[PDB]
Ligand binder design. Structure first.
Ligand SMILES: [Mg+2]
Ligand SMILES: [Mg+2]
Ligand SMILES: [Mg+2]
Ligand SMILES: [Mg+2]
Ligand SMILES: [Mg+2]
Lengths: 138, 201, 109, 175, 190
RNA sequence: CCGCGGCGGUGCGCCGCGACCGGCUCCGGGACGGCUGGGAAGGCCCGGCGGGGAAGGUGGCUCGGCCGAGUGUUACAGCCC
RNA sequence: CAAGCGUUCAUAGCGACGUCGCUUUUUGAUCCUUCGAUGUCGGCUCUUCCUAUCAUUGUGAAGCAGAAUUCACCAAGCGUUG
RNA sequence: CGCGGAGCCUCGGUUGGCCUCGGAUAGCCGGUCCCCCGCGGGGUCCGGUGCGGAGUGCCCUUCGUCCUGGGAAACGGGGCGCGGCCGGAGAGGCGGCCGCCCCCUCGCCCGUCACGCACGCCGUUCGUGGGGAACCUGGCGCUAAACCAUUCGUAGACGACC
């Protein structure tokens, strides 16, 4: 059973291609592999764009089925995608990948350290929880 | 990557896998394909049986003990298909095959190692869902294995065992997560520096 | 105290099918599967390194058992992030599917 | 003719003037091809069938793109077609639902390849024309065609099957 | 041509309670419980009707030959519902010129034992499948009653004895003897 | 002899660097011409003139908590085209 | 393909006038190999393969009641004699 | 078995990752208040994740040495430290879990000083007590069979075999 019903107005994140990593309102469906697509506030012209290069989100919005930019400018703008996206779990694990690649050798030295002691302060508690789990078993 | 490879044959495509194995065998990487019964083939069951039986009739008339060896175990069957994709007349090709190693079921050492999966040979990916097939296990049987029953009962015995480990490992993670929450203000300015350059979010 | 010499395999020497041309070797660097990827590996020194039987001199050292053919990556080799490298002496074929050790120290960052 | 992605290299050309006839007629064909040099060549194949006209005895006056008046707006392209099968030579109505006359036949040429093993050098376009909603016959097209139109992308394979050429995780295909 | 959608709703009665584990439908009514897997056919089985009123099978990016199957799943589900409410009854009437076909059920259903078809000494035996209760009728002379919940199982089993009883090296235009199915119906009719 | 000053030849053996130049293979930028004096689009609005899908609609039916959801039809615009 | 025969009825079984093929166990063409010569006909013995199935196993046909018989399928498993 | 000293040679390497099952028009995990079974397993309910963050795009562990004199962290680690009980057999070869001795006080911030600063240069670093082939110390065990010859034939050319 699916939950994402490629409508007139599924917001879709463009997995890849010339406009990778941008949201896009599917204005209207052309064919069995191509949509008429537009990302007003994410900077993507009304153009054709295939279902293979796009993945799609729980979000919908409500322009009708060949509305003309100004009207998908709104419906995006209120409803407010670019803030609601960024409270999602997408946006925060994207913009994490981002931040690892975007990481100087310094940063990485810090983490090496910060991890180590985290992973000890976490470990000593796990050891102590098994002590309490063994004394509970007694 | 480096070190020894372990590939879990289930859900793969007999030759599609073997081409990928054989490339990396020739680049010096040690591969160990496991669980070859599970390995599966495009075309319907019989098709490939009929195609195997065609193999079995191919046989050196004037003496057969020289003639082609139609090994019956899936390990061996696959080996063959890998081998046909090596230049095995030559020294690097035989030196290659030695870097390969192939089992029916999943043995000592290799039960006890995490283990990988070639999506580009993986059946769910490479095939269409409305198409027919053989398991090299059942193929191997109807051609003259003796050991489909045994490698079943042993793998059921291994699965039951592995499940215990999976469940105990499951129980340690539940301790990790509860112990993060039971100590989250003397690691609350380390976890900070993790999530800032991406790690752990 | 670690890599530096970054990990790579020597795959074949540049070849057609009923020919092969032993100047240029084909170098399969680890973690590089695209021709976009590979523009770092250009110009870098590399080394097929061995030991063999008789002792030989070692700069900053005593005479060791180790020797090296000592080369350089020229350019990329087809879509998949393979690289072509020509060493000073030609490579000895023994090395096919072994290590060679591509460095950083003619960096261009 | 071959292909790439076609373009409307529209063209007009007179049969150059003799002493007897000084102002001979001009004729726009919607020649419909991959560049100029062929779309030039392709009116004259085409005109030489119709008129008594030829590369010696003529001139192209104007050749130039006609380039889409409505390329952000999806449209129901029909095409009174003609081809040459291995047997005979055959007329067709066919519908493509692209948003741009050229791209619409770009389809057609790729299907005549596939649905009939007809190569471009055998095909002839009589005329493309965009059609309204109604007056579409082909159920293939006649479905994309509604308002509350609805998909999932059911058994979505992974591509990037070589980024991780191997992995521990087996893929996924429900999304 | 791929057809964007095809679907069908089965109207489930108030007696029964189907509950689908993903794709696998299980059905429990008065009579018993049945199960079946559509882990091949590949469709989307929703149970949309609240209280519990509709099975709806979708099909979705399907070309002609899978569109077929929408309706076939839809059937093996009705066919289950009729089985677990009413239950089926295939009757099969033995037929002859001469040697009386001499039937005798022999555990509960299970063994259907046939002496004398066409004077043959070999006593044909036939197993039923699990859940298929054969029984020799009354209110009629040469007539079996195969009761069961599952159509599939009940009609192999008819056919097993209908086919076990076949003549060889004759005119089967003339030699019209054996046991064969006369009436596919139900236990309870309503 | 100490200069290793200035000139002319080299390198014992392994090497590394630099800057000109030839040929190449690449990679960043930035400025313009034309064109159906480009098509397309945007924004701002405005004042008009028409047609289709189809409603913040209405209505037959369904499903859910008047409202929300589904289908069906006339089509004006309080959507859009 | 099909005009007929087959009491009737094309096609159970057949099937004209035509027409499309294989096959290399028939003979021809040909002259590519061999004339510093590859032992030239039959018989015996002995292997193995093919099917272009004569038997037998399992089948579908008949103008098959039985009996007996031809048409065909998988089929080359074991048979083919004095 | 342990732990000792030289030296032919043959090479490949230059952190590890210690684990479910499988599905794919679906899965993952939590928690059960409740129910059944043998700390577990199965069930039902709800709550989370699901272009997956108890993510192989993954996790871990560190990588110039020690001084000493603060904070954060504090019983961690060791002595081929030493005995006993496990569990693991598919071709185990590995874990695991318990006493006692002695020794050490290490992850992260910081002060504070130090280590041949070899005067821009190469095979640097380890898996290394590698694999194998030759020889110098102690304790405990060890203590042949095979072939020939002969005989026999159960076998025969000789060979082979009983
Ligand atoms: Mg070394
Ligand atoms: Mg008879
Ligand atoms: Mg007649
Ligand atoms: Mg001779
Ligand atoms: Mg035959």
């Amino acid at each position: 059973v699916f939950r994402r019903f490629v409508e007139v107005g599924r917001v879709a994140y463009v997995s890849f291609g010339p406009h990778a990593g941008k949201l896009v309102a599917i204005v209207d469906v052309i064919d069995q592999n191509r949509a008429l697509v537009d990302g007003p506030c994410t900077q993507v012209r009304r153009q054709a764009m295939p279902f293979k290069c796009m993945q799609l989100t729980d979000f919908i919005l409500k322009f009708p089925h060949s509305a003309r930019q100004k009207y998908v400018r709104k419906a995006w703008e209120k409803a407010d995608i670019n803030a609601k996206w960024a409270a999602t779990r997408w946006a925060k694990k994207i913009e994490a990948r981002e931040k690892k690649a975007k990481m100087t050798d310094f940063d990485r030295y810090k983490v090496m350290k910060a991890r180590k002691m985290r992973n000890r302060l976490i470990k000593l508690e796990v050891k102590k929880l098994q002590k309490a789990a063994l004394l509970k078993a007694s | 990557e480096g070190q020894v490879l372990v590939l879990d044959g289930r859900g793969h495509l007999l030759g599609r896998l073997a081409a990928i194995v054989a490339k990396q065998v020739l680049l010096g990487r040690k591969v160990v394909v496991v669980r070859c019964e599970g390995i599966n083939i495009s075309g319907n069951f019989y098709r490939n049986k009929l195609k195997y039986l065609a193999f079995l009739r191919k046989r050196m008339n004037t003496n057969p003990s020289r003639g082609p060896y139609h090994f019956r175990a899936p390990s061996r069957i696959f080996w063959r298909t890998v081998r046909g994709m090596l230049p095995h007349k030559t020294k690097r090709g035989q030196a290659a095959l030695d870097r390969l190693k192939v089992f029916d079921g999943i043995p000592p050492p290799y039960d006890k190692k995490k283990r990988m999966v070639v999506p580009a040979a993986l059946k769910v990916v490479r095939l269409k869902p409305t198409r027919k097939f053989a398991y090299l296990g059942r193929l191997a049987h109807e051609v003259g294995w003796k050991y489909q029953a045994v490698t079943a009962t042993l793998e059921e015995k291994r699965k039951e065992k592995a499940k215990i480990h999976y469940r105990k490992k499951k129980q340690l993670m539940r301790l990790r997560k509860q112990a993060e929450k039971n100590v989250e203000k003397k690691i609350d300015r380390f976890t900070e520096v993790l999530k800032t350059h991406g790690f752990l979010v | 105290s670690g890599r530096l010499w970054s990990k790579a395999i020597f795959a074949g020497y540049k070849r057609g099918l009923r020919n092969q041309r032993e100047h240029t070797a084909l170098l399969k660097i680890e973690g590089v599967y695209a021709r976009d990827e590979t523009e770092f590996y250009l110009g870098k020194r590399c080394a097929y390194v061995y030991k063999a039987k008789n002792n030989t001199v070692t700069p900053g050292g005593k005479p060791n058992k180790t020797r090296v053919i000592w080369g350089k990556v020229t350019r990329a080799h087809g879509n998949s992030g393979m690289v072509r490298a020509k060493f000073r002496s030609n490579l000895p074929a023994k090395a096919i599917g072994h290590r060679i050790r591509v460095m950083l120290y003619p960096s261009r960052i | 003719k071959a292909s790439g992605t076609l373009r409307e290299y529209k063209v007009v050309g007179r049969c150059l003037p003799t002493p007897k006839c000084r102002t001979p007629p001009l004729y726009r064909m919607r020649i419909f091809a991959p560049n100029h040099v062929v779309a030039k060549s392709r009116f004259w194949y085409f005109v030489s069938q119709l008129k008594k006209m030829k590369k010696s005895s003529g001139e192209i006056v104007y050749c130039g793109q006609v380039f889409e008046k409505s390329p952000l707006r999806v449209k129901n392209f029909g095409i009174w077609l003609r081809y040459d099968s291995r047997s005979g030579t055959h007329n067709m109505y066919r519908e493509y639902r692209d948003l741009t006359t050229a791209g619409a036949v770009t389809q057609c040429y790729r299907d005549m390849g596939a649905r009939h093993r007809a190569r471009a050098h055998s095909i002839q376009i009589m005329k493309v024309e965009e059609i309204a909603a109604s007056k579409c016959r082909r159920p293939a097209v006649k479905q994309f065609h509604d308002s509350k139109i609805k998909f999932p992308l059911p058994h979505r394979v992974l591509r990037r099957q070589h980024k991780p050429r191997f992995t521990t995780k087996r893929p996924n295909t429900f999304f | 041509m791929k057809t964007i959608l095809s679907n069908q709703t089965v109207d489930i009665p108030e007696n029964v309670d189907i509950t689908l584990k993903g794709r696998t439908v299980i059905v429990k009514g008065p009579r018993g419980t049945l199960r079946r897997d559509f882990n091949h056919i590949n469709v989307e089985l929703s149970l949309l009707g609240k209280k519990k009123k509709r099975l709806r099978v979708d099909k979705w990016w399907g070309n002609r030959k899978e569109l077929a199957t929408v309706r076939t799943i839809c059937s093996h589900v009705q066919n289950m519902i009729k089985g677990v409410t009413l239950g089926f009854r295939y009757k099969m009437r033995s037929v002859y010129a001469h040697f009386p076909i001499n039937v005798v059920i022999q555990e509960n259903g299970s063994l259907v034992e046939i002496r004398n078809f066409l004077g043959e000494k070999y006593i044909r035996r036939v197993r039923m499948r699990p859940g298929v209760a054969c029984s020799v009728s009354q209110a009629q002379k040469d007539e079996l009653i195969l009761e069961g919940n599952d159509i599939e199982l009940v009609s192999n089993s008819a056919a097993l004895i209908q086919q076990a009883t076949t003549v060889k090296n004759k005119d089967i235009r003339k030699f019209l003897d054996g046991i064969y199915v006369s009436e596919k119906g139900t236990v309870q009719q309503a």
